[model samples]
Target: QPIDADVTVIGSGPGGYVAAIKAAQLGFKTVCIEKNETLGGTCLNVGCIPSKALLNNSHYYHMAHGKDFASRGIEMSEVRLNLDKMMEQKSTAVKALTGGIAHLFKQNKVVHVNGYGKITGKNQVTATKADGGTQVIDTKNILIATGSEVTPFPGITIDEDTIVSSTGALSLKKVPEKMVVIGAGVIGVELGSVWQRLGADVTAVEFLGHVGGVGIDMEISKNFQRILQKQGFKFKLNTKVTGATKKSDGKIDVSIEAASGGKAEVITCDVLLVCIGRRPFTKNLGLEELGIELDPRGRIPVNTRFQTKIPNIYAIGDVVAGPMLAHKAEDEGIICVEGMAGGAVHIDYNCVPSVIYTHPEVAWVGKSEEQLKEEGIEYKVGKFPFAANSRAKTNADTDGMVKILGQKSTDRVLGAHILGPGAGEMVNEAALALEYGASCEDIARVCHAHLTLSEAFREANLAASFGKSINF
Candidate 1:
C-alpha cells in the first residue's frame, strides 16, 4: 500500500509540467515523465516559442530590410539577413526557456523522468528511458497532459525537408523559393507569413473557404486574407491536398482538387507545410489496458474536476476537452492541481483569447458574429479602423480595425476582435472585459489614454454602444 510519490504525471508539456510543479508545491511528492529529451513540450520547444521567435526575428528583419526605412527618418543601407545567426538566436531562446523549466523542476523538488510514460495500473506508471531502461513508479494520483500533435496529410510523407509539418516549417534550412502551406488556419497562416516575410513566394491551400481558422470572426477572416494577400500571400480556397511527390529537381509537386472533386491541379514548391490541424496525442499510454476511453474526437473524457472515471486518475490540456490553447491548458493545470490541494479557481472557456502571430496580428475573445447569428442572438457591432488612430497614422502602419460586439438589449459585451498592430498583445484588455461581463457602454465610458492602440478598443466600444465613434 506504499507509493513511490503522491502524483505521477505523464508527459511534461506546459500542462503536465505545470501540474507536476504545482502538485509538488502543495506538499505532494511528484514525478513528471516526458517522452522528449527536453523539459517543455511541443509549445516551448517547437510549436509556440520557436515559431514566435522566428516570427519576431523575421518581422524585425523585414522592417530593417524594407524599402520605407529611408522614407522614415531612420535611414540605413545594405540591410541583409544572416539566416544562420537568426536560427542560432532562435535555438538560444528555446534553450533559455526550456532550461529554466528544468531548474524550476529542481527547485520545486519534483522528479524529472526523461522517458515515454504510460499507465500500468490505477496508481502506477511505467516509463521507457532513452537507454532502453525502464522506470516504474507507483503513485497515489495520476495526471495525463500529453497534449496534441500535428495531423498529417493523407497520401504524403513529411520528410522534414521538402514536405514538413509545423515542426520542420519552424527550422527551415533556408527560405524556399516557393512554399505551399496546407490549411490556412492559425499555424498555417502564421508559418506562411514567416516564410513569405523572408522572401518566399508562399501559397496557402485551404479546404475551408475562409482563412484564419473557423474560430475567427468571418469579417476578420476576410480582412486577414486580404491583408496577407496584399503582402504577396497566394491562396487556393476550397482546395484539398490530394497528393504530393518530391522531384529530382528538388521541388515538390503537390496534387490538389476542389473540395467537391470538381477541379484538380498540381502545384510545385520547394517546401510544403501541412498544418491541417492537431489531434489529441494519447499514444502508447496504455489507455486500453487501463480501460480509459477517449471521446469520439480522440480526447480523454474527464469530469469537472479533471478526473477520469476513476477518482484519483486525472487529465487536462490537449488530452482533455476545452480549447487546445497553451494558456487554457496552463490554467487548467493550475486549477486541477489546486482542487487536488483543497483550493479552487474558476475558469471560463468562453473568455479564452485566441491570436494569430502574423503581421497586423488578429486576436479575439468571446463569441463571433457568425456564432451569435447562428444562435439567434441579436447583437450590436462597433468597428473602428486603425487608420483613424493617431499613433497608427503617425507610424503609417494602419491596415486593420477593432470590432466590438455587444448584446442588442442588455448592452453586454459579447465579443471583441482586433486585426491590426499589436493585436496579439492588445487582446488581453478585451479578455479582461469579457471575463468580468463588462458592457460596451462600460468600456466606452472608461477614459482611455491618448494616441494608444488601446484607445481603438474604446473607440470600437463607443461605436458599438452609441452607433457612432467620435473619430472616424
Candidate 2:
C-alpha cells in the first residue's frame, strides 16, 4: 500500500513522537511508524519510565523496613515483599503513560503505522507488519528516531529466569537471592539497587577505576557509592567480568579479575545481569543499504541540522550522536523539525544535562573539576551539604550536596553538579542559568524561598561567585 504525507517519522519514542507532534503543530501532514505494539519506545516501555517507577516503589518498601521514621513514632510490623503488587504498579504506570502518547497521535491526527520500517529508495519507505502485511509510505522527508537497545555482553547469554538484562530484571517474579551485576554503569547500578532494597544480595563489577560513569561530580560519585555500600550493596570496584556459566541448580558462576588481569576470582550468584552500556540503535533500518554514513561505533552520523547524508532524511535520538538521553534527543527532534520547517533553530549539545535518578539522584552539566584542573583553567568552586540546609533538616532526607564551579575571577558559571533529593528536577535551573551565561553571583543574587531545597543552590552560587552568602 502506498500512503503519502508531508512528513514521515519512524520510531515513536521520545524523539520520534515529539518530532511528529512538532511537525503536525507546524501544519504539516505527519505519519509515524512504530515497531512495538506500544507507542513509546524503550524509555517508556522498559527503560527510563518503568525503571523509575520500580525504584520509587521499592524505595517505599525500603523506608517501611527501616528506622528512618522511627522517631516519628511510626512503628510498623515486619514489611513483606509483594513482588506482584509492585510489578502491577509499574505496569499500570507504563500502560497509562504509553496510552497517553497514542491518544496524542489521534488528537494531532498524526498517522500511526505499526510495522518494521525499511528504506526502500530515496524519499520512500516500506514497512512490513508482523501480520505478514506491508505498507508503503511516500513522503518529502523522513525522520528516523529508532532508539538504542541493551548491548548484551558476549560469551554470557541472558536467560530471563536466571541471568537477565535490564528489562527482565525490572519485572522479575521474585528478587534473586544473590544478584551479580556486570558493568557498574548507570543501568547496572540502578537495577542493582532496586533488587538490593527488595532483599537481593547484589555485587556490582565494573572495569572502571571508580563508581558512576566518568565526568560525574567526583564528590557525588564518591559519596553515593559509600551510601549504597552502607545500604548492603557490594562493589567489586576495579574488577572485570571474564565470563559467566550456568550451573545445574540454576545459579550462575561469574569469573572476575582485576582490570589489568593480575588477580582472578570466581563468584557464584543466583543471577548475573549484564549491563556494560548501550550503543546506538540502527539495527535494521537499512542504513547500510542506503549508504547513509555512521560513526565507527555504528551511531548514525549527521550534520548540524541533524540531517544525514541523504538530505530528505534526518535522524535523532539514540540513533544519532551525542548522549543517549531522552530529553537531549527530545530537544534535537524539536530543533530538527523546526529547522526543516524554515524556522530559526539550533542545538548546542554542550549544554545538554546528564542525570542519574538513583536514591539520592545525581545530575551535572558542563565541565567537571578534574576536566578544568587538567586543562589548566582557573576555576573556583562552592560546595554546600544538604545537611546544612533548613529544608533538608526538616524533611530529614539530607544525603548529598550541591557543588558549583565557576571561572576564578569572573562570576561566569562553568559547571554545575547537584546530588540530593530532587536533584534531577533542580539540575534544570542550573542548566537554564548556564544557558543564559549567568554568573555564579547572578545565580546567588536571585531570591529563593526560605527553608527550601533551592536555598542550598542559591547559597552555593553565592559562596562561589562572591565568597559570601546569607546562610554562610
Candidate 3:
C-alpha cells in the first residue's frame, strides 16, 4: 500500500495540532483529523477558553457592582450584567482562537481532515465524515491525540440546562439565582465562582474533605477557601450529591448526603453543575478492537516515548497518562514528535505548573506539603503574605500568601505554592527554578523589581533561605 501520509494525528486539540504542525515542519506529510466542527477540541472551543472569558467578565462585573473600585475613589453607578453580550464575547474569543488554528494548519501544510479518525491497523487509519462517508489513509505513523471529556456521574442525567456539565455551564442563558456544583475541584470552583460572582448563591459539594481540588498545597488550599468564603462562596466538603431532580419551573431539587453515606439532605437550586471530573475520551475510536488495552481510568497507557503497543502508533494529551492540562498536552506533543524525528527531547513533568484562576489565583509547582509529609521528606517552609507586598497593597487585592518549600538538608526548592494576586504568572519563575534544580537561595539572590507582585516570591525565598524577609 502506498503511504498516503507520513504522520496522521487523530485529534486537533493542543496536543494533536502541535504534533501535526511539528511533524509537518520536520518535512513529514502530516494530517490532523478532528471530529468537532471547530478546529480546537475542548480547550479552545468549550473548556478553558470560554470558561476563562466568562470568569473574567463575571469578575469585572462583580467588582463593579460591589464598588470595589470606590476604595481608590474610582466610583461607578448602576452596574449591571448583560448576559447575552458577555456570552457573545466568549464565543468571539473562541472563534478567533479556532480560526487561528486552521490558518496555522494550512500554513504548516498539515492536512485538516474533518471527521473522526480510527486506527484500523498499525499503519492505517480511517477517517469517517459526519455524513457517513469515509476515507482510508494508509500512513507511516499514527498519532492518537483524542483528548478528554467531562466525566458523567452515574444515575445522573446532564440535560445541559438545569443539570449541566462544564460545557453547558459555560453557555448558561442566565445567571442562576442558586447554583449547586457537585465537586469542589478546579472546574467546580472556577465555574461556580463565575455564577456566584454574578449574584448566584453558589454552593460547592466535594466528597473530599477540602476544596480547590486535590494536589493543591494544603496551606494554599486553606487560604484559598477562606478568601473564597469571604467572597460569599459556600463549601460543603465531605458531602456528595446523590441525585438532582428537575422541577417543573426549571429549577433542580438536588439531594446531598455525606460522602460516606449518611445524613441525607435536599436543596433546591436553579442550576446543578456536575463537575465531578474528566475522563479520557478513548471511546469508539476502535482501540479495543485493535487489542490496545486502556487503563481502568480509560487513559491510553503509553511508554516514556509516548508509543503505544505498536511502535509506529503514538498517543498524547488527555487521552494518555498525565495531568489533563492543555499546556502539559502541548509540551508532550512537541516532545513526542521531536523525539520521533531523532531529536533529543525531554520534559520534567514535576515542573509543570497547576493554577486555579479564581480571584487571588492559586498556583503551584512540584510536591505539596502533604505529599512531602507522606514521602517522609523533611522540608522547610518560607511564606510571604501579599498584604506586605507594595504592589498588592496598591491593587488592594491582598487576600493570600506565597509558600516556598525546600529540602531541609539541601535547601533545594522542592515546591512553590502561591495563593496571591498574579500567582499564576508568578508560579512560572518557581517552575523554572525547579527545572534547574535551584536552591531557594538562588531565587533570593536574584534582584526582582520592587513594588511588583513577584517581589513577594523573592521575599518568600529570602525567608526560606535566610530565615527572614526584609519587607514582610
TM-score of each: 0.97, 0.97, 0.98
- lDDT string for model 3 (229-336, tens) is 988999998998888788888778989999999988999988889989999998788888878899989988888888898788889999987788999999999989
Q: Could you give the C-alpha RMSD of every candidate to the true structure, in order shown?
A: 1.5, 1.3, 1.3
In the range 18-51, model 2's lDDT, one tens digit per residue, is: 9999999998889899989999998999998889
Best by TM-score: 3
Superposition TM-score, candidate 2 onto the true structure: 0.97
For model 1, the local distance difference test gives 0.90
Q: Estimate candidate 2's alpha-carbon lDDT, on a 0 to 1 scale.
A: 0.87
Relative to the true structure, candidate 1 reaches a TM of 0.97
Higher-scoring candidate on lDDT, 1 or 2: 1
For candidate 3, the lDDT comes to: 0.90
Q: On residues 1-472, what C-alpha lDDT tens digit does candidate 1 reach at each position? A: 2239888888888999988898899899999998888989989999899999999999998888986566687788689888889999999999999999999999999998888997888888988878898888989899999999988777888888788999998888897999999999999998999999998999999999999887789999998999899999999999988899888888899999998797679999999899999999999999888888888999999887888988899999998888888999999888888888878657898899999989889999999999999999999989999999988998889989999989999999999999999898789999999988999999999998997899899999999999999988
User: How many steric overlaps are in each model, in order?
Assistant: 0, 0, 0
lDDT of each: 0.90, 0.87, 0.90
Give the clashing pairs for model 2: none
